[PDB]
Amino acid sequence: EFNILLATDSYKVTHYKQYPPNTSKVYSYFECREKKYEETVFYGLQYILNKYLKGKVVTKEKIQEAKDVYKEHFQDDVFNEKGWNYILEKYDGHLPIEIKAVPEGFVIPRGNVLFTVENTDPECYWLTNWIETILVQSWYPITVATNSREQKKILAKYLLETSGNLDGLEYKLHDFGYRGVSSQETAGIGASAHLVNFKGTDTVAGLALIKKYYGTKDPVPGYSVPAAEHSTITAWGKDHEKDAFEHIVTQFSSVPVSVVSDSYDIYNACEKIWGEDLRHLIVSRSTQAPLIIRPDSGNPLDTVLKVLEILGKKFPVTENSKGYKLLPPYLRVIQGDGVDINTLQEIVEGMKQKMWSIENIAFGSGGGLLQKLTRDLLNCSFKCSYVVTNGLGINVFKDPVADPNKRSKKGRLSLHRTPAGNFVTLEEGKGDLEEYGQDLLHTVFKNGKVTKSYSFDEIRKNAQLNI
Amino acid sequence: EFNILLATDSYKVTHYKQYPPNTSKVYSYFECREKVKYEETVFYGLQYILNKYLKGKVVTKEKIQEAKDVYKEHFQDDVFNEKGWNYILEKYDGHLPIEIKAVPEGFVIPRGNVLFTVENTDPECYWLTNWIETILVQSWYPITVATNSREQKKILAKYLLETSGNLDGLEYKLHDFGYRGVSSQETAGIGASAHLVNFKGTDTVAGLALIKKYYGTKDPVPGYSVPAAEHSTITAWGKDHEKDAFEHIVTQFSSVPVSVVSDSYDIYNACEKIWGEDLRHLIVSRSTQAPLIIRPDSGNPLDTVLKVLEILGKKFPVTENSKGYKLLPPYLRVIQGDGVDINTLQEIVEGMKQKMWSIENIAFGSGGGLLQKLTRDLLNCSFKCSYVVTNGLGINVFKDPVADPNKRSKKGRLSLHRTPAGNFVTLEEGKGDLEEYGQDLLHTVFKNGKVTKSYSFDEIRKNAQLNI
Ligand SMILES: O=P(O)(O)OC[C@H]1O[C@H](OP(=O)(O)OP(=O)(O)O)[C@H](O)[C@@H]1O
Ligand SMILES: O=P(O)(O)OC[C@H]1O[C@H](OP(=O)(O)OP(=O)(O)O)[C@H](O)[C@@H]1O
Ligand SMILES: O=C(O)c1cccnc1
Ligand SMILES: O=C(O)c1cccnc1
């Protein structure tokens, strides 16, 4: 089905004719360039290696298919049929490429090499950057995992300040983004990246991806709870919202249940329906099976604060040991509308200023978590840094006059820890001097084989917060 | 293999227990809610979803068991509706008892109108309508790409018509550079295909196969490209040999158009000294069908384009076209592919016009701005239940949140009509049945596991044309 010969940017089809004659090696690297988001979670390359790059990826039929498409697409014969046939005949269609990468889950400051790519056969000098397009899509799981982890840092800071511990942190940011991403494939990739940091998800696609490509000791990497949507409330008719609420919390009386409460009037629902008519069905619930009230409209901070004020007047509020107000354990709130890293910060800060514990609230995020992200957020970039031409290696780079931020690194690269425990990327082959301890890049792919793999449990450990 | 039982939001697994008892019908609809203002949307992409995910035998015993096993662990509880899915398998050989009606693909519809509706065709499957919300709502993405691409085409058409008097070349003026900048291979194909509704130039090869498989064109392919350099093929020569790289590349591609990225070290030197002097003899000899296309790729986009054009206008023979705008010789063009989105595209063409440069001189490449920097909230894409039957009684249902009237949803059975003035209106509460507005513009496109109406990519392009 998938054809790697048709999985590149069109212009790359023409690059084999553009490199210097007598070029035997093209060596390229990926970084999140330096320019907020000072460090990045490296995640997602193992998916790409296994799904698209390993094994026999070239066949006679795929070559003919590409040749025919490109003849029409370019209105010209430019496709390197010879070079692809070489890989087919010499290597049984396995890519003569070596990729070295930092371990998945590692948290690396901006401006460092995260992986490198080079050809292992001199005839395939053109192949290194053929697969740039595929490999650069690693920007997306890196950026989802990174932005999710930055939200975890905010939640952890405010949970610690308002409650004194981090209990429940892993469930405080729930993935609501399945319908809000651009494809089924993106849903799985993005949901898996969020699960590097959290355990709550409604994007089921992430589970199958992690099981197939990474693996966990536990049966599943992420969990959900029963929850209403507007259709299951509004189907009862507007005059029967109370009947809908009563039915749903009674069907799910012994597990947590989230009930969207803003179909008609969130404030009436909290004060009169939950707070009076159905109060007897709430105060009876277990600490392990709270009602979770879900507003879903209005200004996010103003709505959360007004919902909490209403609930604190109808239910017995305590003051925890840090001085912050706490709803009874059978009652919680989830804000799932308009949540991104900026509004999450605004809400928890507003709660803190009004003396509400972050224990009371959880968040759901859809587009903000999985779709409202681009390759430019972390300046994810893949560039050639080293070539061998006429048997001599030369260090190559770009350095555009009008934008020093786009200057790329020179020569053969390696990643090291510094004496102070930070990270440094050495350029120009200087890692070979061995002044800086071991290279942290490891070979993960060579000549069609995935050579080093990480479980999802290892990745989660590598991506832990300091605290 | 894809499993539609595992292709929904988790909470929807629990919804069959939440609807009113004795509900036999759930009817839902999709709109781009009323809130560049994006007043009209190109409806595109549902036919892909119908064919790839929803048609045919989508339920098997193995898929039911897989979903059962996953949800038991995911919920730590048995809530999965195994019986309901087995009914579909047994009664319909795994085909979905669903009817979907939709506006024709490529149609350009104002915001706030019904675009498609979904309802179950078997009373036992009242829960199925909104199970497939998640899948179907992903149509927001091709809709939004196609719409935003068409809005950029409107800008380009306006300024090309002003500065040149015609629209020659318009379909090649916005090239898709977004393959590496989207979130997956599947997204690349969907989004590139949506851009090809409006344009013919693309480097996102994945779009071609999607169109061939799911829509079809009379022509062999729906989009085209030209040879072009990247920084690796220039810089690999060494900083002191940029001229050698340029000479090699334009000589290799002497009789087709060739784009050459010229900013590796100093775009202004490259234009004035390398192209403008050292290699000028290799440029002024080229065919009108095979221009050199100089590609800056850094700096302030408008300032860089204007300075590149000023340099080239001093080194090459510029003419004045019939509208009074400056025009480079036909063997020389420029493409700006850095930092392009609908806002900077507008700023560049307006700044060119103010400096008396024809838009004939320029084309644009766009990656993330075209295919990735878009969300479901740009057009307020939304799927909502508007009608149910419970105890044999149909009721019109809706949401109307007190703090956001923009989220009010439509009531009852819906239909899309032409007004007497030729505009569009969505009739609510079954009022289309009164036939005061002629016939419903929605067509049944899916019924009981079968695609029942479909559109070629050529028809979609025709429907999506600009008025001009
Ligand atoms: O973070 P987001 O990308 O916005 O996703 C989260 C939203 O999505 C759901 O609503 P729904 O599908 O109704 O969205 P809508 O009201 O905009 O149509 C859900 O109830 C949240 O409000
Ligand atoms: O519109 P965009 O999403 O930005 O994609 C277009 C950019 O992508 C390419 O550069 P490259 O891969 O170098 O991007 P980079 O400079 O960030 O590395 C290309 O030369 C354009 O500059
Ligand atoms: O579980 C939820 O409340 C949910 C999941 C996805 C989208 N909106 C809400
Ligand atoms: O053809 C090009 O110039 C191109 C294609 C994709 C990305 N960047 C540039």
PDB file of C-alpha atoms in Angstrom, chain A residues 45 63 67 83 101 132 144 173 176 183 217 237 362 388 390 408 420 443 447 449:
ATOM      1  CA  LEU A  45      10.818   8.259  15.734  1.00  0.00           C
ATOM      2  CA  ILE A  63       9.475   1.536  -8.771  1.00  0.00           C
ATOM      3  CA  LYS A  67       8.119   6.178 -12.456  1.00  0.00           C
ATOM      4  CA  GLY A  83      19.260   4.392  -8.094  1.00  0.00           C
ATOM      5  CA  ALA A 101      19.176   9.127  17.868  1.00  0.00           C
ATOM      6  CA  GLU A 132      13.798  13.982   5.179  1.00  0.00           C
ATOM      7  CA  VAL A 144       2.661  17.249  21.354  1.00  0.00           C
ATOM      8  CA  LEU A 173      -5.215  16.871  31.649  1.00  0.00           C
ATOM      9  CA  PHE A 176     -10.488  15.304  24.148  1.00  0.00           C
ATOM     10  CA  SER A 183      -6.786  12.411  10.466  1.00  0.00           C
ATOM     11  CA  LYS A 217       3.683  -3.697  31.105  1.00  0.00           C
ATOM     12  CA  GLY A 237     -36.032  17.501  25.870  1.00  0.00           C
ATOM     13  CA  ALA A 362      -9.314  18.771  36.006  1.00  0.00           C
ATOM     14  CA  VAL A 388      32.200  13.448   1.283  1.00  0.00           C
ATOM     15  CA  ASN A 390      36.150  13.126  -4.097  1.00  0.00           C
ATOM     16  CA  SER A 408      22.815  25.325  10.826  1.00  0.00           C
ATOM     17  CA  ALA A 420      27.749  20.495  35.016  1.00  0.00           C
ATOM     18  CA  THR A 443      22.142   3.631  16.321  1.00  0.00           C
ATOM     19  CA  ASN A 447      20.390  -1.057   6.579  1.00  0.00           C
ATOM     20  CA  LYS A 449      16.710  -3.009  10.533  1.00  0.00           C
TER      21      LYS A 449
END
